[PDB]
Design an enzyme around this catalytic site. Structure first.
Site, PDB file in Angstrom:
ATOM      1  N   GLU A 154      -1.430   9.483  -0.283  1.00 32.93           N
ATOM      2  CA  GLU A 154      -1.758   9.215  -1.673  1.00 32.93           C
ATOM      3  C   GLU A 154      -1.122  10.330  -2.500  1.00 32.93           C
ATOM      4  O   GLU A 154      -1.112  11.473  -2.068  1.00 32.93           O
ATOM      5  CB  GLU A 154      -3.279   9.257  -1.809  1.00 32.93           C
ATOM      6  CG  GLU A 154      -3.814   8.881  -3.154  1.00 32.93           C
ATOM      7  CD  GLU A 154      -5.326   8.782  -3.165  1.00 32.93           C
ATOM      8  OE1 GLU A 154      -5.951   8.585  -2.100  1.00 32.93           O
ATOM      9  OE2 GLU A 154      -5.898   8.899  -4.263  1.00 32.93           O
ATOM     10  N   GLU A 207       0.803  -1.229   0.000  1.00 31.63           N
ATOM     11  CA  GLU A 207       0.000   0.000   0.000  1.00 31.63           C
ATOM     12  C   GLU A 207       0.836   1.280   0.000  1.00 31.63           C
ATOM     13  O   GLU A 207       0.397   2.305  -0.502  1.00 31.63           O
ATOM     14  CB  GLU A 207      -0.938   0.031   1.225  1.00 31.63           C
ATOM     15  CG  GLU A 207      -1.940  -1.122   1.316  1.00 31.63           C
ATOM     16  CD  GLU A 207      -2.964  -1.124   0.188  1.00 31.63           C
ATOM     17  OE1 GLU A 207      -3.315  -0.047  -0.316  1.00 31.63           O
ATOM     18  OE2 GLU A 207      -3.431  -2.201  -0.191  1.00 31.63           O
TER      19      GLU A 207
END
Length: 242
Positions: A89, A67
């Site tokens: 992100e 991730e």
């Protein structure tokens, strides 16, 4: 204590490039923050025989490494030595506010932390379970390292509807239902990938993202001296909706 399974040296060996100047963390993902957060969750890394505890830690770190990966083919020490490179992100233009949950002015719910927690409703859920206001302070997940690890471990330990907890799968506490058997969801690392992002990565044949998760798992198993075990992929598993 999970500290008996993984010490500071092993942690650094597994996540050897997290503090690289080319990574975002810059000291965020500390061993001390990890063990501090882990202590808040009874059962994590302390369930079963020694190899099962090590395997839980290896699977958790593998999934979360994917991730937050800064690895690629050709990276120094290979792609599987670059886990925990990112905290947030890359695209921060999407607020990820779903209509049913509050979306305070000037707050965004893009991916943050080891499990890349996303969407206002997930921040709301994690917040309620941890006893911290994450709807109004979503940035804590990228600023407070203990809370950051807590959100990931919370997710790992939490069952939801037809989905068992990742914890129960890896420790053999989950007994698949007839629906699971029919969907080819056999206990193993693949089911964990299915719980985490099966709608996109499972049941449609090979997935390079799934392959990245497996690569990290294998390297971590090699370092911790664990055999890989069966059912590493989820190519043939129907995503959780069985």
């Amino acid at each position: 204590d999970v500290g008996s399974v993984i010490d500071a040296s092993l942690f650094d060996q597994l996540l050897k490039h997290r503090n690289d100047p080319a990574c975002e963390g810059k000291g965020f993902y500390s061993y001390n923050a990890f063990v501090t957060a882990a202590r808040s969750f009874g059962g994590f890394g302390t369930t079963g025989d020694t190899n099962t505890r090590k395997r839980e830690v290896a699977a958790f770190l593998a999934q979360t490494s994917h991730e937050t990966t800064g690895g690629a083919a050709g990276s120094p020490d290979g792609p599987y030595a670059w886990g925990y490179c990112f905290v947030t992100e890359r695209d921060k233009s999407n607020k990820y506010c779903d209509p049913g949950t509050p979306c305070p002015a000037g707050k965004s719910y893009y991916g943050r932390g080891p499990i890349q927690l996303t969407h206002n409703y997930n921040y709301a859920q994690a917040g309620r379970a941890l006893g911290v206001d994450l709807i109004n302070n979503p940035d804590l997940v990228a600023r407070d390292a203990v809370i950051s690890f807590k959100t990931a471990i919370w997710f790992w330990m939490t069952p939801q509807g037809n989905k068992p907890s990742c914890h129960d799968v890896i420790t053999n506490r989950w007994t698949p239902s007839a629906a699971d058997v029919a969907a080819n969801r056999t206990p193993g690392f693949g089911v964990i990938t299915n719980i985490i992002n099966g709608g996109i990565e499972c049941g449609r044949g090979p997935s390079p993202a799934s392959g990245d998760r497996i690569g990290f798992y294998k390297r971590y198993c090699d370092v911790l001296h664990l055999s890989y075990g069966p059912n590493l992929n989820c190519r043939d598993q129907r995503p959780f909706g069985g």
